Design a protein around this ligand. Structure first.
Ligand SMILES: *O[C@H]1O[C@H](CO[C@@H]2O[C@H](CO[C@]3(C(=O)O)C[C@@H](O[C@]4(C(=O)O)C[C@@H](O)[C@@H](O)[C@@H]([C@H](O)CO)O4)[C@@H](O[C@H]4O[C@H]([C@@H](O)CO)[C@@H](O)[C@H](O[C@H]5O[C@H]([C@@H](O)CO[C@H]6O[C@H]([C@@H](O)CO)[C@@H](O)[C@H](O)[C@@H]6O)[C@@H](O)[C@H](O[C@H]6O[C@H](CO[C@H]7O[C@H](CO)[C@@H](O)[C@H](O)[C@H]7O)[C@@H](O)[C@H](O[C@H]7O[C@H](CO)[C@@H](O)[C@H](O)[C@H]7O)[C@H]6O)[C@@H]5O)[C@@H]4O)[C@@H]([C@H](O)CO)O3)[C@@H](O*)[C@H](OC(=O)C[C@@H](CCCCCCCCCCC)OC(=O)CCCCCCCCCCCCC)[C@H]2NC(=O)C[C@@H](CCCCCCCCCCC)OC(=O)CCCCCCCCCCC)[C@@H](O)[C@H](OC(=O)C[C@H](O)CCCCCCCCCCC)[C@H]1NC(=O)C[C@H](O)CCCCCCCCCCC
Ligand SMILES: C[C@H](Oc1ccc2ncc(/C=C/C(=O)O)c(C3CC3)c2c1)c1c(Cl)ccc(N)c1Cl
Ligand SMILES: C[C@H](Oc1ccc2ncc(/C=C/C(=O)O)c(C3CC3)c2c1)c1c(Cl)ccc(N)c1Cl
Lengths: 561, 576
């Protein structure tokens, strides 16, 4: 599979192969430079030390510098080439994953953590390029290094080289033979921090301290274990290699071997045996790093194979000044088969407010999800302006609907652009300031240092749940969407300046198709039609006179609130 | 400047490290020997090429292999030991630091916690407490080991051919400055990428998190366009990161190489080389080549070390932060339970409208008061004050005739029980949640009946392992109606004299709410209670009902009495 993963990847790389092939040449030459420099080491001792002043002056210092210049350039070139390519493919895959994930359905987003998906973008893409680049570099240059070194070794003393060779199998096998709580740490600290208030009033300081003590000590020993394991592996490896060499030098004792040697040649031969010790290390490990790179890549490719939400509606409607009708609708969450909704018909007539109230258990919220077609439905139909929602392309329908809630997520931008999110160009700031004014956001805003152009960004998080909601109104207002989905289930139960919010929302709800998941009494009373939801079905509905005496469970709910 | 800053930081840290001083001692000794091993293997390089090439077969044969192996043994051992002691010392120093931080954050104010998303805290303490040990370990290691070797190597160079050694000295300063200059021009830009990687992170995270809002509002192009820029900038930065090392490294090696070349060139001249041999030329030059690695490490440590002490300092700023104000000195065990507010005014910090202006309510021992009002008044806030999560600004809150602030927070908070729907369910067994921090003090039979008296056993008996079923995992298993009865089960067991009941967030929509109502009746007969009331039941039986708006009590009385008066209370009754 791993090479099958790679060949799927190669297309994204192929456009940049040119950088690879130049990088390859540069790597080869660097190995050549390093081999060539040990070559020089023979003349310095034989020719150089055989009473020749000329050698130690010209050939050595000037060539060594010459070679150093070539060593630097080539390394610079290869680094730049690799970096460039590595940067190019990392960027490309990050952009595909970003676009792909944004297009997925919300079902996709419920499965995985937002941190996991983010981890894919930041880390897993740079890792695959990293590991493959390291793999390629290691192969090419370390490949070149060892054959250049072995040639040279054999050339000046083939006897010793063939000794060393016959020992390589043994050394290879011997080197083979010796070669979670952190989550609990984060968990332990995090769970104390989530339960700080509870900890304070039951006096749970002692038990949490001991709990952390236990976890923190377990990880200390676990973290020690890994360091200790790594520590012993290589001391033996070098010991074993050393043995092989000790034996090689032992061989030099015998006249048959030694007579072909000088001070210069024996020096280079051993020098090149030690030079080998790192290439061989890198080349044994190359396959491992290549594997882990391809494992991350196949993860990415898994995500990229997942289907994005289907948008086959070919109908556009520029504005909906019309009702939404539900026809015998049933909907089930993917993953379980106890339907959140079973047979729902409700008519939000164009321009009037419908508030639906329900128990926490019921899917009052799921209805609101459905109209915006975050999830598609199992049975029945939803028609907006008489056409089924599915007949419309998603952009137009979603443009029709606006959402307002305490938990609408804020982008790190100028408050003004947050209000005119995704339509900064279209809306003149004159409007923006007005919409922020009407939603009674403006008093809180002007306290900011930059005001509207101040950014709630870079994790500043100056705003609070109450303040955000008034921006959500401002956003929905300014855009002037034909339909309102307003969620009050997020409790927001200890507000400071709720009056502002209420007047804002009345303005917003006015003469605007408003569908409301309501927990608040003012919205309830002034809604035109009220609908009760118990589990998956509409139990009853009631208007003004109907409100006074509930056929449904309004009385019991009214007592609660 | 930073020399001083880091060494004040290090002195602060030392007390934590000194109890493991033995580990550091031994590691340093082993490191010296490790460096000595390398020196001695180069010393062998001379007899190999002089006595071994003066037709003495003994040297090469009988003992050149054996001495080498022996030293490589020693080297390996010394290596393992030193690693062992360091890892050992590092582990505990890290662990002890984490314990201190954990213990310190536990005692921090509530406002502090609300403000900072604990991810940063959490992230900081794990990551930064490791990074201070890792950097300080590496700094020590290189100093001792690389310091030992360069001395040993420099001495060796003088013993054989002192002439060459000194040529390298005088060159060493001009080289050092040149190397230092090069290094400072190019490679101190790690943070540069950090800023751009943050932008990458930020844009990815907010699309991932705010995906639904993107879909609704049309953020596709804008959010893609934003990501397009930042990814390119990140990419370019990584190249700059790479490029910095690419340019620095051979230029630096070139510089050192020219010094060496000059030493070599000087060796041609008869004055120095006459005394030299093939043995001692190679040992001297090999040693010069050896030196390059240690010298590189040493210059880089002060950067390495400053990185460690910086992380230490950030931890110390958390340690320096102020804990909960706790000057009471007064402990009371099972306070009778009457709470009086006098002229209490309270504004949440960093807001400019008081949550409560001039509250006076007296709650007699054993009796319940219902705080009911329009949503957004300070009935919820008042609850928070008795536990002294926040101190009032003006006035005083009395518990049994003394200000809460004269009481130890501990004793003060053991008097107060809390019962609400949003109680936290620690990851544990049901038994251990009810007797949350007193598992050693309450018997099973004690726990079993507390749960029974809270009408909770109907949904406990249906669990997998019943009362010892493990609940938690973000409180997933339990529901709001079930949580109240667990919160009640705690209050009953502890039998705290002051109850704070919050039905605001409670769900009256519960198949078993009459059972929650029975548990409440049995919960509050004996003790003083302060109910943020929203249920017909509790307001019916309540002793006093106080109406709050804009943090002001606007009327008081009995239920029947108040409805007779037909003031603010009745209008709330008239609607629902
Ligand atoms: O290159 C260079 O270097 C090198 C070094 O070395 C070695 O080492 C070792 C060790 O080391 C280490 C350690 O420490 O360990 C290692 C490494 O690594 C690794 C690892 O991993 O481990 C390894 C492997 O495995 C591989 O694989 C690798 C790869 O790469 C991978 O991939 O890896 C490293 O480290 C590392 O590690 C780490 C980890 O571990 C973790 O911790 C990592 O991480 C890191 O990394 C980093 O990096 C980066 C940077 O740095 C950059 O880089 C780049 O690149 C790369 C690559 O690829 C490239 O290629 C890449 O990869 C990268 O990427 C980049 O791109 C940075 O940046 C980064 O950062 C990042 O990262 C991270 C990651 O992650 C991580 O994390 C965690 C923690 O932290 C963990 O856990 C994980 O896992 C991980 O992954 C990231 O992450 C980060 O970040 C991120 O993330 C985070 C988160 O957390 C954060 O931060 C954020 O978020 C983000 O950002 C970042 O940061 C990184 O860091 C590290 O680094 C290293 C380092 O680097 C350092 O620095 O280290 C050791 O052991 C060794 O050693 C020693 O010391 C030495 C020796 C001893 C001595 C003694 C001797 C004795 C003798 C005796 C004799 C006898 C007689 C008697 O040793 C050895 O071994 C030895 C022993 C053995 C024994 C044997 C036996 C004996 C017996 C015998 C028998 C006979 C008898 C007779 C070392 N070494 C070696 O190898 C060796 C050598 C030495 C030297 C020499 C000496 C002297 C002596 C003589 C004797 C004679 C005899 C006869 O050698 C040789 O070869 C020799 C030959 C020559 C000789 C001559 C003679 C003459 C005489 C005179 C006469 C006249 C080296 O190696 C090299 O070298 C070689 O190789 C080369 C060639 O070969 C050579 C050539 C030369 C030539 C010359 C001519 C001469 C003649 C002349 C004529 C006249 C080097 N190069 C050199 O060296 C230098 C050159 O050469 C210069 C030249 C100049 C010349 C002058 C002229 C002259 C004039 C004239 C005058 C005369
Ligand atoms: C005879 C001996 O043959 C092997 C064969 C395979 C090896 N495969 C891996 C490794 C190292 C792995 C690691 O370090 O993780 C080594 C050791 C030389 C470094 C190997 C040595 C050998 C060779 Cl051919 C070349 C140079 C030296 N000096 C030695 Cl002894
Ligand atoms: C004369 C010359 O003096 C310095 C002095 C300070 C140095 N300080 C740092 C570095 C490296 C820094 C780095 O790599 O970041 C070097 C280079 C030799 C490696 C230095 C060289 C020198 C010396 Cl005394 C010893 C051995 C060699 N061979 C050389 Cl040239």
């Amino acid at each position: 599979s791993t090479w099958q993963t790679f060949r799927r990847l190669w297309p994204t790389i192929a456009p940049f192969k040119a950088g690879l092939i130049v990088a390859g040449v540069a790597l080869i030459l660097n190995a050549a430079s390093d081999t060539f420099m040990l070559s020089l080491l023979k003349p310095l001792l034989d020719d150089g030390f055989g009473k020749t002043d000329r050698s130690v002056l010209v050939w050595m210092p000037l060539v060594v510098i010459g070679l150093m210049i070539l060593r630097g350039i080539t390394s610079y070139v290869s680094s730049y080439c690799i970096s460039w390519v590595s940067g190019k493919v990392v960027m490309t895959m990050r952009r595909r994953l970003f676009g792909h994930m944004m297009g997925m359905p919300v079902s996709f987003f419920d499965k995985q953590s937002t941190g996991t998906l983010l981890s894919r973008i930041t880390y897993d893409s740079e890792q695959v390029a990293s590991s493959s680049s390291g793999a390629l570099i290691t192969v090419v240059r370390e490949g070149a290094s060892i054959i250049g070194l072995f040639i040279m070794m054999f050339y000046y003393s083939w006897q010793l080289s063939i000794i060393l060779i016959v020992l390589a199998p043994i050394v290879s096998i011997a080197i083979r033979v010796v070669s979670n709580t952190m989550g609990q740490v984060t968990t332990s600290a995090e769970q104390m921090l989530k339960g700080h208030k509870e900890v304070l009033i039951f006096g749970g300081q002692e038990v949490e301290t001991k709990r952390f003590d236990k976890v923190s000590n377990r990880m200390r020993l676990q973290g020690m274990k890994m360091v200790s394991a790594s520590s012993i592996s290589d001391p033996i490896i070098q010991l074993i290699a050393s043995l092989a060499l000790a034996f090689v030098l032992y061989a030099a004792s015998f006249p048959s071997v030694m007579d072909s040697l000088t001070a210069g040649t024996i020096t280079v031969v051993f020098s090149s045996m030690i030079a080998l010790m790192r290439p061989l290390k890198s080349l044994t490990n190359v396959n491992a790093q290549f594997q882990r790179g391809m494992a991350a890549c196949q993860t990415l490719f898994t995500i990229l194979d997942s289907e994005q939400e289907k948008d086959e509606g070919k109908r556009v409607i520029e504005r909906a000044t019309g009702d939404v009708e539900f026809r015998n609708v049933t909907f089930t969450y993917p993953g379980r088969d106890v339907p959140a909704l079973r047979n729902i018909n409700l008519k939000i007539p164009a321009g009037k407010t419908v508030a639906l109230v329900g128990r926490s258990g019921s899917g009052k919220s799921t209805i609101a999800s459905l109209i915006t077609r975050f999830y598609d439905i199992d049975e029945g139909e939803i028609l907006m302006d008489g056409h089924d929602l599915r007949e419309y392309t998603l952009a137009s329908l979603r443009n029709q609907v606006a959402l307002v809630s305490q938990n609408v997520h804020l982008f790190n931008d100028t408050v003004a652009n947050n209000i005119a999110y995704a339509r900064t160009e279209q809306y003149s700031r004159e409007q923006i300031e007005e919409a922020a004014r009407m939603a009674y956001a403006m008093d809180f805003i002007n306290k900011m240092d930059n005001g509207l152009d101040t950014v709630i960004g870079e994790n500043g998080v100056l705003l609070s749940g109450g303040q955000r909601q008034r921006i959500a109104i401002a956003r929905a207002l300014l855009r002037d969407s034909p339909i309102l989905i307003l969620d009050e289930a997020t409790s927001a139960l200890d507000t400071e300046s709720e009056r502002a919010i209420q007047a804002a929302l009345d303005e917003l709800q006015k003469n605007r198709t408003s569908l409301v998941i309501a927990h608040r009494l003012s919205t309830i009373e002034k809604a035109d039609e009220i609908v009760v939801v118990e589990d998956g079905v509409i139990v009853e509905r009631g208007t003004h006179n109907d409100l006074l005496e509930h056929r449904g469970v309004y009385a019991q709910l009214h007592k609660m609130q």
